[PDB]
Write a protein that binds this ligand. Structure first.
Ligand SMILES: C=CC1=C(C)/C(=C/c2[nH]c(/C=C3N=C(/C=C4\NC(=O)C(C)=C4C=C)C(C)=C\3CCC(=O)O)c(CCC(=O)O)c2C)NC1=O
Ligand SMILES: C=CC1=C(C)/C(=C/c2[nH]c(/C=C3N=C(/C=C4\NC(=O)C(C)=C4C=C)C(C)=C\3CCC(=O)O)c(CCC(=O)O)c2C)NC1=O
Lengths: 304, 304
């Protein structure tokens, strides 16, 4: 059971298209920072570690951001509007913050389509999607509607429903795809392809995204005394298992995204998506709309 | 069965806080217009009838609005951004358009909180709401969660779940309310309180809102030759039955909003809301978030 032993939740590094910070409470002093901060934020780790978050935030946005980070309803406040100011120039980010194992983690991803009406695309996506899912008359139609919808919103080359059986083996029961992607519909795979510790994690954190499998992991630096491993179980930017990156590579997949499907509190399956020849940095609104449809499908597994 | 006979779908008038227009296709010539247009739009019916819609729209917004109104996916494009320009001054509206009985109907409601991030409140409302509804372990908890959520979002003094029995009598099975509202929990009412033609309409159109029961109905004027009754079955501003306005008055209700709950294609119940001492012009994002939660609850009636 070597597969089941890799501690995927404490890799010590993140996917470098975003930045990860850890903040003290209540002061919001930065105790950790991913080392790709120069490229993404325009500041080095030395400038960041030990500094209060506010020193880097555009002032008209400072108070509210800080109030949100200190709030107990943090989970319901995401995404946070983070405007990072360095040398009189502003960079914009969606901040996604959460608390886990006593740490306050703030992940920053570059803001997309800043000219679009914010959240209008989420609004249409979940409204149109919900009606499509409600029209399904049975489990197969539900599965088909979901993959069609997710592929439509994301542009992924392939989207499937992967269903687990009683021994945790899986089966591709529905598939939507572009013609350039080989069909995986009907294939069954052994349980070890998604090992135990991964399934346990995916029962708790329902989303994972890997916009490119070729990336340099960015180590998370910390202040002296704060170097114990950082539990990234709920971190959107968590660097993923290298063994899994090889599996995608061998499968001919350049990018991936999956969403847990839950039933009676247990992992029932996944919505799994692949981009076969190119990257896929899915915008936040789209990604979150897909998670939402996943929750809806999960709620309907009891019925259909 | 006098109750069942009133033709509620062709009252010839609307609630005057919005404006209703009928547009020809494909030219978008205005063939009908509610007579409260001077107060709401700043133009008279004489100026409007027979004129093309574009003459009244701010030019940078004209092409897209017209393209949307001509689209077959109209239902998925609502709400429309309508900027009404009269004497160099702009007024802003959410346009809600639909097609029914061969007519293209455009309803205009003043845009609310224009400084808030558009659709951000819908995003949080349906995300937080969905998780609250999914935590319900049975039908009662589901009903309780829904009324608590709807009351929370709208500020209504009372929100209930009204469930129909086999002979179309109803029962108040869950209730959330402010202390100033009498409790209706547990009361049963005869079928005639929501007569047959109303129930049929509510199986098709899942939302109705009456922001004040004291209002002067605004007659819908039409060009000569176009004066047949206008079928307002799917019109948000449809003037409601005067008999029902008396029922609310006698019940001590100043404003109301209800949402159809559907199961197996049949009307199962309603989410009904009341404001006891004041009006209630519920913003579009909130109203639509509530309809959405209603659809979710309806989808879950099969399971719980
Ligand atoms: C069509 C079928 C299909 C399968 C089966 C599939 C497997 C799969 N394996 C995964 C993770 C994983 N897979 C593995 C490990 C292994 N994998 C192995 O084949 C072996 C031999 C090991 C180890 C001995 C690990 C460790 C993870 C966790 C990745 C992480 O979250 O860090 C994930 C989640 C991450 C993602 O969404 O890409 C999927 C979906 N994806 C698919 O679309
Ligand atoms: C707590 C209980 C409770 C009840 C029972 C209730 C009844 C009720 N009656 C309604 C419509 C109506 N009710 C009536 C008619 C009648 N009504 C009568 O008591 C009689 C005697 C007639 C006619 C003989 C009609 C015609 C409508 C349709 C209104 C419309 O859509 O135009 C509606 C939909 C409009 C709205 O949301 O306000 C409700 C909810 N509301 C509640 O909260």
């Amino acid at each position: 059971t070597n597969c089941d032993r890799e501690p995927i939740h404490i890799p010590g590094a993140i996917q470098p298209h975003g930045v990860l910070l850890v903040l003290s409470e209540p002061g919001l002093v930065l105790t950790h920072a991913s080392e790709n901060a120069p490229a993404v934020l325009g500041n080095s780790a030395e400038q960041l570690l030990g500094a209060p978050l506010g020193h880097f935030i555009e002032p008209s946005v400072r108070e509210p951001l800080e109030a949100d980070l200190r709030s107990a309803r943090l989970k319901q406040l995401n995404p946070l509007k983070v405007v990072w100011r360095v040398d009189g120039v502003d960079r914009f980010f969606d901040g996604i913050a959460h608390r886990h194992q006593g740490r306050l983690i703030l992940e920053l991803e570059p803001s997309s389509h800043r000219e679009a009406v914010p959240f209008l695309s989420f609004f249409h996506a979940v409204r149109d999607g919900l009606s499509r899912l409600r029209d399904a008359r049975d489990l197969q139609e539900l599965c088909e509607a979901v993959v069609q919808e997710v592929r439509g919103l994301t542009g992924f080359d392939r989207a499937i429903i992967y269903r687990f059986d009683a021994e945790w083996n899986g089966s591709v029961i529905a598939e939507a795809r572009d013609a350039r992607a080989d069909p995986y519909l009907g294939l069954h795979f052994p349980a070890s392809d998604i090992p135990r510790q991964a399934r346990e994690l995916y029962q708790l954190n329902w989303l994972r995204i890997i916009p490119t499998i070729d990336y340099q992991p960015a180590r998370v630096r910390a202040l002296p005394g704060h170097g114990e491993p950082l539990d990234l179980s709920f971190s959107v930017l968590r660097s993923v298992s290298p063994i899994h990156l090889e599996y995608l590579h061998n499968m001919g997949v350049q990018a991936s995204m999956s969403i847990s499907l839950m039933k009676d509190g247990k992992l029932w399956g996944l919505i799994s998506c692949h981009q076969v020849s190119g990257t896929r940095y899915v915008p936040y609104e789209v990604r979150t709309a897909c998670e939402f449809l996943g929750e809806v499908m999960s709620s309907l597994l009891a019925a259909k």
